[PDB]
Structure formats: structure tokens, C-alpha cells
Design an enzyme around this catalytic site. Structure first.
Site, PDB file in Angstrom:
ATOM      1  N   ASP B  44      -1.318   2.053  -1.456  1.00 54.98           N
ATOM      2  CA  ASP B  44      -1.904   3.117  -1.984  1.00 54.98           C
ATOM      3  C   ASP B  44      -3.348   3.553  -1.335  1.00 54.98           C
ATOM      4  OD1 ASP B  44      -3.152   5.101  -3.637  1.00 54.98           O
ATOM      5  OD2 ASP B  44      -3.109   3.844  -5.492  1.00 54.98           O
ATOM      6  N   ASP B 228      -3.320  10.737  -0.528  1.00 55.18           N
ATOM      7  CA  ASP B 228      -3.148   9.825  -1.669  1.00 55.18           C
ATOM      8  C   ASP B 228      -1.682   9.280  -1.703  1.00 55.18           C
ATOM      9  OD1 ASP B 228      -3.123   8.072  -3.866  1.00 55.18           O
ATOM     10  OD2 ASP B 228      -4.638   9.375  -4.949  1.00 55.18           O
TER      11      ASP B 228
HETATM   12  C1  LIG Z   1      -4.263   2.222 -10.112  1.00 58.09           C
HETATM   13  C2  LIG Z   1      -4.218   3.002  -8.855  1.00 58.09           C
HETATM   14  C3  LIG Z   1      -3.349   4.695  -9.143  1.00 58.09           C
HETATM   15  C4  LIG Z   1      -2.155   4.162  -9.421  1.00 58.09           C
HETATM   16  C5  LIG Z   1      -1.052   3.488  -8.285  1.00 58.09           C
HETATM   17  C6  LIG Z   1      -4.182   5.243  -9.955  1.00 58.09           C
HETATM   18  C7  LIG Z   1      -3.996   6.953  -9.702  1.00 58.09           C
HETATM   19  O1  LIG Z   1      -4.202   7.618 -10.846  1.00 58.09           O
HETATM   20  N1  LIG Z   1      -3.441   7.310  -8.426  1.00 58.09           N
HETATM   21  C8  LIG Z   1      -2.878   8.675  -8.254  1.00 58.09           C
HETATM   22  C9  LIG Z   1      -1.812   8.835  -9.398  1.00 58.09           C
HETATM   23  C10 LIG Z   1      -0.425   8.379  -9.420  1.00 58.09           C
HETATM   24  C11 LIG Z   1       0.407   8.348 -10.643  1.00 58.09           C
HETATM   25  C12 LIG Z   1       1.522   7.587 -10.593  1.00 58.09           C
HETATM   26  O2  LIG Z   1       1.898   7.433 -11.955  1.00 58.09           O
HETATM   27  N2  LIG Z   1       2.055   7.324  -9.615  1.00 58.09           N
HETATM   28  C13 LIG Z   1       3.301   6.015  -9.432  1.00 58.09           C
HETATM   29  C14 LIG Z   1       2.953   4.940  -9.772  1.00 58.09           C
HETATM   30  C15 LIG Z   1       2.131   4.384 -10.648  1.00 58.09           C
HETATM   31  C16 LIG Z   1       1.892   2.664 -10.525  1.00 58.09           C
HETATM   32  C17 LIG Z   1       2.715   1.850  -9.844  1.00 58.09           C
HETATM   33  C18 LIG Z   1       3.663   2.515  -9.098  1.00 58.09           C
HETATM   34  C19 LIG Z   1       3.888   4.085  -8.970  1.00 58.09           C
HETATM   35  C20 LIG Z   1       4.625   4.865  -8.209  1.00 58.09           C
HETATM   36  C21 LIG Z   1       3.994   6.166  -8.097  1.00 58.09           C
HETATM   37  O3  LIG Z   1       5.078   7.463  -8.054  1.00 58.09           O
HETATM   38  C22 LIG Z   1      -0.081   9.329 -11.561  1.00 58.09           C
HETATM   39  C23 LIG Z   1      -1.251   9.881 -11.675  1.00 58.09           C
HETATM   40  C24 LIG Z   1      -2.103   9.808 -10.393  1.00 58.09           C
HETATM   41  O4  LIG Z   1      -3.395  10.104 -10.082  1.00 58.09           O
HETATM   42  C25 LIG Z   1      -3.884   9.807  -8.650  1.00 58.09           C
HETATM   43  C26 LIG Z   1      -3.603  10.919  -7.948  1.00 58.09           C
HETATM   44  C27 LIG Z   1      -5.404   9.514  -8.769  1.00 58.09           C
HETATM   45  O5  LIG Z   1      -6.203  10.601  -8.442  1.00 58.09           O
HETATM   46  C28 LIG Z   1      -6.717  10.036  -7.246  1.00 58.09           C
HETATM   47  C29 LIG Z   1      -3.353   6.494  -7.302  1.00 58.09           C
HETATM   48  N3  LIG Z   1      -3.475   6.971  -6.111  1.00 58.09           N
HETATM   49  N4  LIG Z   1      -3.424   5.192  -7.697  1.00 58.09           N
END
Ligand SMILES: CCC1(CC)CC(=O)N([C@H]2c3cc(C(=O)N[C@@H]4c5ccccc5C[C@H]4O)ccc3O[C@@]2(C)COC)C(=N)N1
Ligand SMILES: CCC1(CC)CC(=O)N([C@H]2c3cc(C(=O)N[C@@H]4c5ccccc5C[C@H]4O)ccc3O[C@@]2(C)COC)C(=N)N1
Ligand SMILES: *[C@@H]1O[C@H](CO)[C@@H](O[C@@H]2O[C@H](CO)[C@@H](O)[C@H](O)[C@H]2NC(C)=O)[C@H](O)[C@H]1NC(C)=O
Ligand SMILES: *[C@@H]1O[C@H](CO)[C@@H](O)[C@H](O)[C@H]1NC(C)=O
Lengths: 342, 354
Positions: B44, B228
Site C-alpha cells: 500500500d 494509492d
Molecule cells: C490502513 C491503510 C489503508 C487501507 C489499506 C487506509 C485507506 O483508507 N486507504 C485507501 C482506501 C482503501 C479502502 C479499501 O477498503 N481497500 C481495500 C482493502 C482494505 C484493507 C485491506 C485490504 C484491502 C483491499 C482493498 O481493495 C477503502 C477506502 C480507502 O481510502 C483510501 C484511499 C485512503 O485515502 C488515502 C489506503 N490506501 N490504505
């Protein structure tokens, strides 16, 4: 802003010999069986020209002409339509056709090109001209649907859209690079300059200085990287003043060192970036005379506001990378200190 | 000014196969402790904490995965004064304690690595995935805890790796790869264009506008773009999102019918200075239960004042190869973008930038 390729397996070398007629000629294979010609590589035009046996003029017959009737891949194109190009030091006339080309180890098929049939309105009497490989942009094609370089890339998906020029007339090691650059030909960093207009290799220019005197720019000016002229250029309007600060001088093989120890330094400005040319870099010996290696040129579209940098007055001192952009990707000219010989 | 792509030995760029699970997760392999315990984390670029799911979490959604048992690890070390850790994001929350452990990623070992042991997963989306951990690849400022990012620490202990990583996403042919220490020409074609990072928190670069067909969605104010890998979707602020779906509707689709249904949708143009990135209907739409749906979702980044747009793994990285270059001092960090080579199979030779 762009990443120049430099892997030693994806960058191919085209040695360029500097003939005594002021020509930088490479090697190109035309037709099947291959016929070898020695064209020049030109960043100031995009038509691919070949001299053919259809031209029996004195200046054609003195070179190794390309015989299209012996080639099994030749195809006359637009039968019945001639193509006439007139420039400052001569004219070129011929017919249009399609042929297969080999450049280094890369093959190009269905390639549109012009067969030189006439060179009559001349400088082709003072050079052994065999052809032009155009490296400008496709909009500059006088005829044809695809630039030779775009089509070479189109058919070689492993090449990055880049080529560079190393100019070393002293030891005749000038090289044409296909697909990137090489640590062997430059030192320091490469500074990228965006192409403002995808016609020539044209970039923004912010001023020119000869010593303390500002020659440019009171108006929006530009710079064009043209391997087809060994001279740097200046518009007619600006030219009477350039020679006025860069005079000719008596020189000898042992005297040039001293004569030039008072001349000014030419500074080309590309935004916050300044490129310097020294007297021994922009002057040349011509019959016991030191003469600014500069020439007058008015680029029509640019409203006489375009300045050209040639192979001897610039590229010999500054390694140059050309990055061809795709849809949405901007094109760039990269400039770096040429790693000088001897 | 410019970066060049120099060749490097195949051991200073190591490849991490990423499998695309049915739960929309791109998971690699990570070895924790000694004896090694295997976890399958996600990588990530939108966070930098290293999270592992542990036998300390007996919740329903934890017990379904291969938990990491720290009491079986002889290199695990809690610090005498413990630190609790609570992270809440859009689709759930994660709670745990901090500890130090030895990790192996791509046959490279990292010691003294601070990481969070997952103890709770209750806000939830952890009910919809087999979550085992997160490898955070953001910048250190985003560390909820620790003095050294897992990436900064990995490089610190392996001087053969360049501070770069890239992502090749190809779920269709299951050849998605995570590259540490450089890039591979097998994964892109054309040239790579570098975009400077404006603020070293996320991998964030300036953005000058977005177009859906002829309609300008942005930008009336200074906006930004964040690469991201944690979201498979591209994101958009609330203000801009309600209008997007208004011009980009869903549609009923099938494996053989999407071709025609989507042949009239608009083209999205992302503007990065002189660089224009286009996404075609077949590239930003996805088949989701007999429906073509823009792979987009609403996200408001608090720091950017709802002016940041995010590029995910499916709606963007699948089509655009991405290199991440971390910079030092006067030199900024940069995100490199190139057209993904779809016929790539393996990574024959590797290289790095500058
Ligand atoms: C704790 C770090 C996080 C989460 C990884 C925090 C976070 O919120 N994000 C972004 C994000 C992700 C999701 C989401 O459920 N992802 C799915 C997920 C979640 C957990 C495990 C596996 C998977 C597979 C993938 O599909 C929802 C909203 C969301 O908002 C973003 C854009 C934050 O804004 C910058 C991250 N980059 N990392
Ligand atoms: C047909 C395309 C051309 C010519 C290549 C047309 C052209 O005029 N030029 C420039 C140029 C060149 C000369 C010149 O004699 N060059 C010599 C020459 C000529 C023919 C063959 C070999 C050689 C070796 C070289 O020394 C004189 C003026 C001049 O003007 C430039 C700046 C046009 O402005 C953009 C191009 N770049 N392309
Ligand atoms: C992990 O941390 C420990 C302590 O913080 C490091 O151990 C130190 O190593 C240096 C290097 O020789 C010694 O001079 C110190 O005396 C050690 N202190 C101890 C053991 O308490 C250890 O090197 C770190 N692991 C690394 C760097 O891989
Ligand atoms: C060769 O190029 C011409 C250029 O327009 C094109 O029309 C033609 O289709 C090409 N050859 C083939 C076999 O398509």
C-alpha cells in the site's frame, strides 16, 4: 521530466563519418537485395530522400546511386506526381515511392520516401549527396503518411522513442544513437527542454548574450535543433548586430589561440538555464581567418524569431537527446556537455 | 534534471509476485520471525505502517486467516513500555500493539522492524476479505508509530537496493508484480515521464485538470493526485463525484457484450502539466454483477481540503506502469508513469532510474 533510456542493450549506435564536404553521413540499407547509401541525418526535416539512378546529372552520377529497378521491394507511389523542395543552398526534385529500409539492425517496411530525380533550380556540385534521413515531426512531411522514425518505432516495439547525436569531427567518432543515450558521449547532467511546437525540434528561448550585450530576446523567441546545418543561425533583423559584436579575424594554426583571447562568450538562455559558447567553440579557421561559425536564417512560421543550433557550433560541444512524445506525451530536447576527444 | 534508466544486476531489483484474490486484494508474501511464519499482505502506497494479523485477535474475521503467532517467534520483541495503536479509515478500523520483529521480503531480511500486531478489527469490510497484513510504502511522516519506515529500514540494511519500487498490475494473466529497487523494461513501453512529489506524505503530485469527454470536472483550485495502491478504484472529492456519476452511468454488461455498450462512453483526461493521461471506457469500467460500473469512488483527503484525486490499482495502474523514486535533500521524490506493456509475461532484465 522525461527518463532517457540508457540500458546498453536497448541503445544502438550509428557511426557518422564527417566527410571533407562538411557532411555527417551514416549508413542506410535500401531495398532487397540491400543497396547501401550514405545519407545525412536531419532534425530539421522529416522527408526521407534517396538519390537514384533516375538522375543522370553530373552531381548524381558521381555517387553510388540507388537503382530502384534492381530492388525487388520498390513501389512507385502517386505515379505522376512530382515533389519539389527548395531551400537556401539548392533545390531537390523527385518522385514518390515506397521501399524497405534497414537502419543498423532494425528493418522498416512499407516506408514512403522520395526518389531524387533533379537537383536543378548549387551546393550538390560541392558535396557528394546521397540522401536525407528526416528526423523532424510528421507534420513536416512534404509527402507520405508516416515519418520514417515514427514508423521505425511503430515496427520495433522494444525501442524507446529517443535518439541522440554525438558530434566529434576531430577524431571522426561522431555517432547517431537509436533508442536512448550513452555515458560514453556526455558528462554531467542532461537538462530537458520541452518542444513548444511539434514541427521542428523547437523549444522556448529566453535570450542571447554576446559578452555583456544582449542580442535577445525582446520578443518571444525560439530555438531549433538542426543537424542539417553545421552553422548556428540568427534572423536577418538580428544578424547585422551579431557579426557587429563577433568580427572576423586573421588566424593561423599557431595564432588562433591568441587572437581569440579577447572575444566575448555567447550565452543562450532557456529559462533559468544558461548555455555558454566560447570563442574557440563558435569560431573556425577559414583561409587564415577566424570567422564566427554563424549564418543568417529566417524561419517563416516563427516570424523571424527562431534561432538554430548546428552540428559544429553547438552539437559538437553539447550532447543532444531527442525524446519523441506520443499522444498526450510531450516531446523534449535534452542537452548535456559533450564528452570531448583529444 | 533528467533521470536515465541504467541496467542493473537482477539481484538489486527483486520481484514480488502479487496474486489478485477474489476479494479484490493484491497480496504478496512476507515471512515474519524465526522460524518464518508466512503472511500474505497487501502493498500500500497510501500508508507506511506495517500491520500483521496475530493470534492476539480472536475475532471472527481474524480466525479465518493464518494468524501470526508472536509467541512462536524467537526474534519477536515487545518493548518494555508498550504503545497501543488505533487506525480508522473509510471501510473499517484496525487496533493493535507495537512490537519489533525480523522480516524477509524477497529474500532480503530486515531486523528491528517496528510493526503493529493486529488485535481488533471492529468498527466492517474485514468481513469481506482474508486480511493478513499491510506493507505500508508511504513516507515516514505517515507512521503511526516507529522511528523507521519498513521501506527505509529495508534499504538501510541492504545497500544493494536503490530507493525505488514499481508496480505492474495485470490481474487477467496473473502476472502482477511488485518490484523493489528499480523497474523492468518488460512491463512498460514508450518513455517514462516523471512527476514531482509536492508533499512527502502520500505519493502526491500536482494535478491541473480532469476531463470526461468535453466536460471539465476540475480544477478551479490547486488540486493534487495521489497514487494509492490500497484502493482498486480511482477516487474523487464529494463536490466533484456527484457530477461524475451523472455523466458516467452504469450499464448492463456481459463478458461478450461490454465491447458494444461501452463504445460510446467518454474518455477521461488527467492533466499533469505537459502530460495528459487518458482512460478509455473499457479501462475505467469493470464488470460487476452484470453491470458496467465506473471503477470510481468518493474519497475526501482531509489534508488536501478535498482537492486530491486518487489513482487505484484497477482503474489506473493496470494501464499505466508506475515507478516510485524516493528523493534525498534538495532532490524531490518522484512518481514515474509509462504505458503498461500488456503482452509482458516475465521480467527478463531489470534496471533503475538515475
Ligand atoms: C490502513 C491503510 C489503508 C487501507 C489499506 C487506509 C485507506 O483508507 N486507504 C485507501 C482506501 C482503501 C479502502 C479499501 O477498503 N481497500 C481495500 C482493502 C482494505 C484493507 C485491506 C485490504 C484491502 C483491499 C482493498 O481493495 C477503502 C477506502 C480507502 O481510502 C483510501 C484511499 C485512503 O485515502 C488515502 C489506503 N490506501 N490504505
Ligand atoms: C532538405 C532539408 C534541409 C537540408 C538538409 C533544408 C534546409 O534548408 N535545412 C537547413 C539548411 C541547410 C543548408 C545546407 O546547405 N546544409 C548542408 C547540406 C545540404 C544538403 C545536403 C547535405 C548538406 C550538408 C549541410 O552542411 C543551408 C541552409 C539551411 O537552412 C536550414 C536551417 C533550413 O531551416 C530550417 C534543413 N535542415 N533541411
Ligand atoms: C537492532 O538494534 C540493536 C540495539 O538497538 C543493535 O545492536 C547494537 O549493534 C551495534 C553494532 O555493532 C553495537 O555497537 C551495539 O552495542 C548493539 N547494541 C545492543 C545489542 O544493545 C542491532 O545492531 C540492530 N540491528 C541491526 C542494526 O541490524
Ligand atoms: C502501406 O502503407 C500505405 C500508406 O497509406 C497503406 O495505405 C497500406 O495499407 C499499407 N500496406 C498495407 C498492406 O496495408
Amino acid at each position: 521530466h522525461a527518463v532517457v533510456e540508457q540500458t546498453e542493450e536497448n541503445v544502438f549506435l550509428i557511426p557518422l563519418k564527417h566527410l571533407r564536404d562538411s557532411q555527417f553521413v551514416g549508413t542506410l540499407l535500401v531495398g532487397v537485395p540491400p543497396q547501401e547509401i550514405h545519407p545525412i541525418f536531419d532534425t530539421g526535416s522529416t522527408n526521407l530522400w534517396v538519390v537514384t539512378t533516375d538522375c543522370e546529372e553530373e552531381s548524381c552520377k558521381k555517387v553510388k546511386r540507388y537503382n530502384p529497378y534492381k530492388s525487388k521491394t520498390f513501389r512507385r507511389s502517386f505515379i505522376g506526381k512530382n515533389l519539389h523542395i527548395v531551400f537556401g543552398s539548392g533545390s531537390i526534385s523527385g518522385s514518390i515511392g515506397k521501399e524497405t529500409f534497414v537502419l543498423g539492425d532494425h528493418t522498416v517496411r512499407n516506408q514512403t520516401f522520395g526518389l531524387v530525380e533533379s537537383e536543378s533550380n548549387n551546393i550538390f556540385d560541392y558535396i557528394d549527396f546521397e540522401g536525407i534521413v528526416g528526423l523532424g515531426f510528421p507534420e513536416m512531411l512534404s509527402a507520405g503518411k508516416v515519418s520514417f522514425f515514427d514508423n521505425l518505432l511503430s515496427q520495433n516495439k522494444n525501442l524507446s522513442p529517443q535518439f541522440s547525436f554525438y558530434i566529434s569531427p576531430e577524431d571522426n567518432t561522431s555517432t547517431f544513437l537509436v533508442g536512448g543515450v550513452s555515458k560514453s558521449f556526455y558528462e554531467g547532467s542532461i537538462y530537458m527542454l520541452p518542444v513548444v511546437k511539434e514541427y521542428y525540434w523547437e523549444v522556448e528561448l529566453d535570450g542571447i548574450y554576446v559578452g555583456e550585450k544582449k542580442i535577445c530576446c525582446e520578443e518571444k523567441s525560439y530555438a531549433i535543433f538542426d543537424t542539417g546545418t553545421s552553422y548556428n543561425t540568427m534572423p536577418s533583423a538580428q544578424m547585422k548586430g551579431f557579426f557587429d559584436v563577433v568580427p572576423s579575424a586573421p588566424c593561423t594554426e599557431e595564432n588562433y589561440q591568441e587572437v581569440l583571447k579577447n572575444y566575448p562568450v555567447i550565452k543562450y538562455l532557456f529559462g533559468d538555464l544558461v548555455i555558454e559558447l566560447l570563442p574557440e567553440e563558435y569560431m573556425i579557421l577559414n583561409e587564415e581567418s577566424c570567422i564566427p561559425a554563424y549564418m543568417q536564417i529566417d524561419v517563416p512560421s516563427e516570424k523571424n524569431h527562431a534561432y538554430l543550433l548546428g552540428s559544429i557550433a553547438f552539437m559538437r560541444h553539447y550532447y543532444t537527446v531527442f525524446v519523441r512524445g506520443a499522444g498526450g506525451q510531450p516531446s523534449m530536447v535534452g542537452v548535456a556537455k559533450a564528452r570531448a576527444a583529444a
